[PDB]
Amino acid sequence: FVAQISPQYPMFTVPLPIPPVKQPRLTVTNPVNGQEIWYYEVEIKPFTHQVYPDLGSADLVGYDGMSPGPTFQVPRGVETVVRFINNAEAPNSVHLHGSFSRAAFDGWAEDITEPGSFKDYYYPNRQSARTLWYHDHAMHITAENAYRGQAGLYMLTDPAEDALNLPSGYGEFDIPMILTSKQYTANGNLVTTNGELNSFWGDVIHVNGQPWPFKNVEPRKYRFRFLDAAVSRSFGLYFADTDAIDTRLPFKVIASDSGLLEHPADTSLLYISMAERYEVVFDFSDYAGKTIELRNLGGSIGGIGTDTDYDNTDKVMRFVVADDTTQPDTSVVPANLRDVPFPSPTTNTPRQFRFGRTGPTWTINGVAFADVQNRLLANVPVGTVERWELINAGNGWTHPIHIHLVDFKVISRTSGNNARTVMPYESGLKDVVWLGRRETVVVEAHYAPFPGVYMFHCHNLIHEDHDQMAAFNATVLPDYGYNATVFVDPMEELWQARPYELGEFQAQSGQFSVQAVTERIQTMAEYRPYAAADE
């Protein structure tokens, strides 16, 4: 490893913070079905926070002026409208990662909101229970917007999964674990990602926005919701007793990007790359009175990646395990979690997408996103199941690939270094898959249920910004209906950002009056954006 560049930090001295739950402002009755739609207001604004206790503070920009943004908790079947208000200094575009939103509510990179404007995002919340996350996607400034704080968690819940009796209680035994990797100046401010064209690895590991924290835990089971929200750093996570720091302790993975696995996957090492979500149950029962360190495999994630490793990037956080529990642990991890809704399999030859570099620019089949005339790389009729072959021929870089709209099954992985194939925790449904060194992955997806133009890209945010993103069009015929003509173009004027005055927001009047919000949402709802999922 390489010497740390950021100032020395007081390791494992600050408790793991938990982002607060985001509460809706009000609900609006949907005239179509008489259901309540939950309406939220999120203010994107600059803020500072004192990351290094004995230095200066860091400049950030976040949802509701915090990083991570607040955590949404939404039950399946409840539609939501979130008004993302830009009261900051650069444009934004919000992507709810994990949601089959319509194209104009999906965070298309050109679909920006300027400072002094807001955009209303209408979300369906119909998919399987899963850990989604919302984050910036504005063209060519995504890495810095995310880095400086525009990412938060969004939990879609299902009461039918209650009976599973998994470890529960947000911030109690259900713990968000948002990972980031950054670098700090000598006075404790952030080093900018601007100017970086290869990757911004970072030498300070954060969980939920906090460098190298600790958490006091009871000797029992916890559900951890891991999310790699870093700009460029991938992880190989493992747990180890501080008395045997090299010995990986077993745990279970219970969910991936799109929701629960069919069965828990017994795991001692969890590969997790940018934008991937995995939910883990760890049992601290056997480690009462010990300290368990969450660590990160070195040698560039054990040869799967190419990331630079530093003095302390092998460390994530510490769990200090109590002698005994306060209450008995009545939670379980069932052998059978759910039936996973895999798409009907196809034998058609996969579509092929090569992720590489064309000179300094990161590209897809030699194309960059700025190239408007060539960036639409696939037309797929709505309802088609397709396999895509995702190729990383290079040994010098890696790419976690995200395909919007869909959930996909990971069919195969080859490695030119023979390092791995499909992992056990990739057994279910995902929407990001890591192309490690010399890896080719085939995925299978139902391109459904909504027509429109959607993105796919590498989710290394440096690669993404420069310029590794393309589009596909999920297409329908002229007689399809469902108001498709106003929902296929992500830049559709009907759904564009709107200017606001700060005073009317603060006074909750005008555009922000109960009447105006109610009427705006009821009118949106009349277009019935998500009806095709209700067949």
Ligand X SMILES: *[C@@H]1O[C@H](CO)[C@@H](O[C@@H]2O[C@H](CO)[C@@H](O[C@H]3O[C@H](CO)[C@@H](O)[C@H](O)[C@@H]3O)[C@H](O)[C@H]2NC(C)=O)[C@H](O)[C@H]1NC(C)=O
Ligand Y SMILES: *[C@@H]1O[C@H](CO)[C@@H](O)[C@H](O)[C@H]1NC(C)=O
Q: Smaller CB distance to Cu ion: residue 28 or 453?
A: 453
- Both structure tokens of 451: 């027509």
Return the residue of 142, 273, 415, 460 that touches Cu ion, per CB under 5 A. 460
Q: Smaller CB distance to ligand Y: residue 34 or 360?
A: 34
> x/- string (CB under 6 A) for ligand Y, residues 442-481?
---------------------------------------x
Q: E strand or H helix at 283, and its extent?
A: strand 277-283
Task: Let me know the angle formed at the C-alpha of 323 by 317 and 324, rounded to the nearest 5 degrees.
Answer: 110
Burial class (CB in 10 A: 0-12, 13-18, 19+), 19: buried
Q: Decide: 100 and 76 in contact? Cβ < 8 Å.
A: no
Q: Which does 275 bind (CB under 5 to 8 A by kind): Cu ion, ligand Y, ligand X, none?
A: Cu ion
Interaction with ligand Y in 513-532: which residues (CB under 6 A)? 526-528, 531
Q: Which does 478 bind (CB under 5 to 8 A by kind): ligand Y, Cu ion, ligand X, none?
A: ligand X
Interaction with Cu ion in 308-337: which residues (CB under 5 A)? none
Q: Smaller CB distance to ligand X: residue 376 or 419?
A: 376
Q: Smaller CB distance to ligand X: residue 108 or 134?
A: 108
Asked if residue 458 binds Cu ion (CB under 5 A), the reply is yes
- Judged by CB under 6 A, how many residues of this single chain contact ligand Y? 7
Burial class (CB in 10 A: 0-12, 13-18, 19+), 523: exposed
Q: Which does 318 bind (CB under 5 to 8 A by kind): ligand Y, Cu ion, ligand X, none?
A: none
Q: Which does 229 bind (CB under 5 to 8 A by kind): Cu ion, ligand Y, ligand X, none?
A: none
Q: Decide: 438 and 394 in contact? Cβ < 8 Å.
A: yes
Asked if residue 31 binds ligand Y (CB under 6 A), the reply is no
Asked if residue 483 binds ligand Y (CB under 6 A), the reply is yes
Task: Let me know the angle formed at the C-alpha of 363 by 94 and 412, rounded to the nearest 5 degrees.
Answer: 85
Q: How far is it, in rounded angstroms, from Cα 532 to Cα 398?
A: 36
Distance from first CA to last CA of the chain, Å, rounded? 55
Q: How far is it, in rounded angstroms, from Cα 497 to Cα 116?
A: 10
Q: Smaller CB distance to ligand X: residue 356 or 381?
A: 381
Least distance to ligand Y, CB of residue 123, Å: 17
Instruction: Report, in this order, helix, strand and coil percent for the chain, each rounded to 5.
Output: 10, 40, 50
Interaction with Cu ion in 266-305: which residues (CB under 5 A)? 275
Q: Decide: 128 and 155 in contact? Cβ < 8 Å.
A: no
Q: Smaller CB distance to ligand Y: residue 177 or 524?
A: 524
Least distance to ligand Y, CB of residue 534, Å: 11
Return the residue of 463, 471, 476, 500 that touches Cu ion, per CB under 5 A. 463
**CA nearest to 495, candidates 119, 160, 205, 227:** 119
- Both structure tokens of 258: 């799109």
Q: How far is it, in rounded angstroms, from Cα 391 to Cα 441?
A: 7
Least distance to ligand Y, CB of residue 474, Å: 18
- CB count within 10 Å of CB 135 equals 28
Listed in sequence order, the residues at least 6 apart from 8 whose beta carbon sits closer than 8 Å to its beta carbon are none
Q: Which does 488 bind (CB under 5 to 8 A by kind): ligand X, Cu ion, ligand Y, none?
A: ligand X
Least distance to ligand Y, CB of residue 122, Å: 12
Asked if residue 30 binds ligand Y (CB under 6 A), the reply is no
Q: Which does 399 bind (CB under 5 to 8 A by kind): ligand Y, Cu ion, ligand X, none?
A: Cu ion
**CA nearest to 456, candidates 343, 346, 380:** 380
Return the residue of 22, 45, 83, 97 that touches Cu ion, per CB under 5 A. 97
Q: Which does 485 bind (CB under 5 to 8 A by kind): ligand Y, Cu ion, ligand X, none?
A: ligand X
Whether cis (ω within 30° of 0) applies to the bond prior to 15 is no
Least distance to ligand Y, CB of residue 520, Å: 12
Least distance to ligand X, CB of residue 380, Å: 10
For residue 519, which amino acid is it? E
Q: Which does 483 bind (CB under 5 to 8 A by kind): ligand X, Cu ion, ligand Y, none?
A: ligand Y
Q: Which does 290 bind (CB under 5 to 8 A by kind): ligand X, Cu ion, ligand Y, none?
A: none
Least distance to ligand X, CB of residue 109, Å: 14
Least distance to ligand Y, CB of residue 287, Å: 55
Least distance to ligand Y, CB of residue 482, Å: 6
Q: Which does 273 bind (CB under 5 to 8 A by kind): Cu ion, ligand X, ligand Y, none?
A: none
Q: Decide: 206 and 182 in contact? Cβ < 8 Å.
A: yes
Q: Which residues bind ligand X (CB under 6 A)?
A: 376, 451, 453, 473, 475-476, 478, 484-485, 488
Which residues partner with 266 through β-bridges? 252
Q: Which does 47 bind (CB under 5 to 8 A by kind): Cu ion, ligand X, ligand Y, none?
A: none
Task: Let me know the angle formed at the C-alpha of 462 by 459 and 463, rounded to the nearest 5 degrees.
Answer: 65
Least distance to ligand X, CB of residue 135, Å: 24
Asked if residue 482 binds ligand Y (CB under 6 A), the reply is yes
Q: Which does 482 bind (CB under 5 to 8 A by kind): Cu ion, ligand X, ligand Y, none?
A: ligand Y
Displacement of CA 413 from its chain's centroid (Å): 22
Q: Decide: 337 and 264 in contact? Cβ < 8 Å.
A: yes
Rounded to a whole number of angstroms, the CA Rg of the chain reads 22
Q: Decide: 427 and 265 in contact? Cβ < 8 Å.
A: yes
Pairing of the two strands 408-415 and 376-381: unpaired
Which residues partner with 154 through β-bridges? 72, 132
Which residues lie near Cu ion (CB under 5 A)? 97, 275, 399, 455, 458, 460, 463
Positions that interact with ligand Y (CB under 6 A): 481-483, 526-528, 531
